[PDB]
């Protein structure tokens, strides 16, 4: 894709995403990979240094992705001093919904027709080799499953038992249902 170039008056020419980063807007678009997550981490670290007090706006339009990649974003969001506000555009599914709920409490938003989906993790990696190797990877996946449900329950002010029920299979929610659930705080209109 051709990323448009915009001019900032101060003149400085930016691509439109660097221009929005100047306004403390970080985009997570598409699958969460090592490379896309590290760009988010790099932007979060950079924005904290520019101003540790001003809010960072984390715009999420993602179907999910790697858990470890999403956890690098998650720990960076919680570590850095400035509040990270999260906004759901289009969809926040799987780790995208996790990072959406991971925003600062009171500053988690979704657009009115966005779709938010939460579910237990799939394969974090293949389970081949010997039964001893498969047992190890199964145990690690169960630990990740419990860790995700526990952190989700903390984000949503719900019991761990509620998240274990609701993440068993793909749980699709409107913006209103996610607000009632505890994934987001407000729904934006204008």
């Amino acid at each position: 894709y051709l990323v448009p170039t915009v001019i900032e008056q101060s003149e400085r020419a930016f691509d439109i995403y660097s221009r929005l980063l100047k306004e403390r807007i970080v985009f997570l678009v598409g699958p969460v990979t090592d490379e896309s997550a590290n760009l988010v981490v790099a932007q979060l670290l950079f924005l904290e240094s520019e101003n540790p007090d001003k809010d960072i706006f984390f715009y999420i339009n993602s179907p999910g992705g790697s858990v470890t990649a999403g956890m690098s974003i998650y720990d960076t969001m919680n570590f850095i001093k400035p509040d990270v506000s999260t906004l759901c555009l289009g969809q926040a599914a799987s780790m995208g919904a996790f990072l959406l709920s991971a925003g600062e409490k009171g500053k988690r938003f979704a657009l009115p027709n966005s779709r938010i989906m939460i579910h237990q993790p799939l394969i974090s990696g293949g389970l081949g080799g010997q039964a001893s190797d498969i047992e190890i990877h199964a145990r690690e996946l169960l630990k990740i499953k419990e860790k995700l449900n526990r952190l989700m329950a903390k984000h949503c002010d719900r019991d761990l038992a509620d998240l274990e029920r609701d993440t068993d299979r793909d749980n699709f929610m409107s913006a209103e249902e996610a607000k009632e659930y505890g994934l987001i705080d407000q729904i934006l209109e204008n």
Partner: protein, 337 residues
């Protein structure tokens, strides 16, 4: 006895429409000015210092009119200075001591009365260093005048030419600074409104609400040195005139615009009468000019141009009626013979 602040405002309500907070501030300041003047000066009593005023308002809001109306019932010397004519000490132009010179000439050079006078310094915003930081070069017309006024706004001894220099103490002289800080609304908006790009950010004016929350930080960012703002503790703000105030300005005051034109037609033998919808349309059109009440004249002069051109030629004319269609449409006012 002394006139109460309510009476001072009642004298201002005859000429100024609205701006109740600024009129109340001016009335209280004049009342406290008189009280300081008659308070005992020596003894176990505390010496009362003055509280100066800074009038902040848009164009055509009534700052100069407030000063002129106040000057009619002061009982103490008063002058209207011009900051655009002021300069630094070592360069050409009028020095800040010319302010004391004018206040002294108003009272037959009786220093005892000049030291008890009130000074209105207009266009105080025109000496503001637009830099917000130390000017890279000598601002002889701006920052230098602000520095020269610090001793004058506060208490000092002014040395002015005779009517052999004269020593005038500016400790009990009240100073009323005024100006239309044009770029101040942007400063206040940037400080208060979290403007930016994206959701959850402000996008952009409401000069009345912005001026109602003005703070010294904004005046510093605009170009006023903090030492001058600290010497102007009272910050009276004037609101932008709304559609309902611009209608009362046309008819209610002593020297209202409609009365001025009725007198212009009174130099002839023709009566000038406006309609209610006509006045409302004139006010709504002047609102769009962004010039304050000064825009009402641009509308009443445009609509009455052809009528005033033909007025001395028309014979037997006795009354002119300006309707709503005369303002919103290029029609001619009803002529009554």
């Amino acid at each position: 006895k002394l006139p109460t602040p309510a009476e001072i405002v009642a004298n201002l309500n005859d000429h100024v429409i609205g701006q109740e907070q600024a009129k109340k501030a001016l009335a209280v300041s004049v009342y406290n000015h008189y009280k300081r003047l008659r308070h005992p000066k020596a003894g176990a009593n505390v010496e009362l210092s003055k509280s100066n005023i800074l009038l902040i308002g848009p164009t055509g809001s009534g700052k100069t009119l407030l000063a002129q109306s106040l000057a009619r019932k002061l009982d103490v010397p008063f002058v209207m200075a011009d900051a655009t004519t002021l300069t630094e000490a070592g360069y050409v132009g009028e020095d800040v001591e010319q302010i004391i010179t004018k206040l002294l000439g108003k009272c037959d050079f009786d220093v005892e009365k000049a030291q008890r006078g009130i000074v209105y310094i207009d266009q105080i915003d025109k000496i503001s260093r637009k830099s917000d930081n130390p000017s890279i070069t000598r601002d002889v017309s701006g920052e230098g005048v602000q520095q020269a006024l610090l001793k004058l706004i506060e208490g000092t001894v002014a040395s002015v030419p005779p009517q052999e220099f004269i020593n005038v103490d500016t400790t009990n002289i009240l100073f009323i600074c005024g100006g239309a800080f044009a770029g101040l609304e942007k400063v206040i908006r940037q400080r208060t409104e979290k403007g930016g790009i994206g959701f959850g950010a402000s996008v952009h004016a409401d000069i009345t609400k912005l001026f109602g929350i003005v703070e010294p930080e904004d005046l510093i960012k605009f170009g006023l040195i903090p030492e001058l703002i600290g010497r102007l503790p009272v910050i009276a703000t004037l609101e932008i005139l709304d559609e309902d105030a611009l209608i009362n300005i046309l008819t209610e005051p002593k020297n209202a615009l409609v009365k001025q034109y009725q007198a212009l037609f009174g130099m002839e033998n023709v009566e000038l009468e406006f309609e209610e919808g006509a006045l409302r349309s004139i006010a709504r059109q002047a609102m769009e000019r962004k010039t304050g009440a000064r825009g009402l004249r641009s509308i009443v002069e445009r609509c009455l141009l052809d009528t005033m051109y033909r007025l001395p030629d028309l014979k037997g004319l006795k009354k002119v009626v300006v309707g709503k269609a005369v303002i919103e449409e290029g029609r001619e006012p009803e002529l009554v013979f």
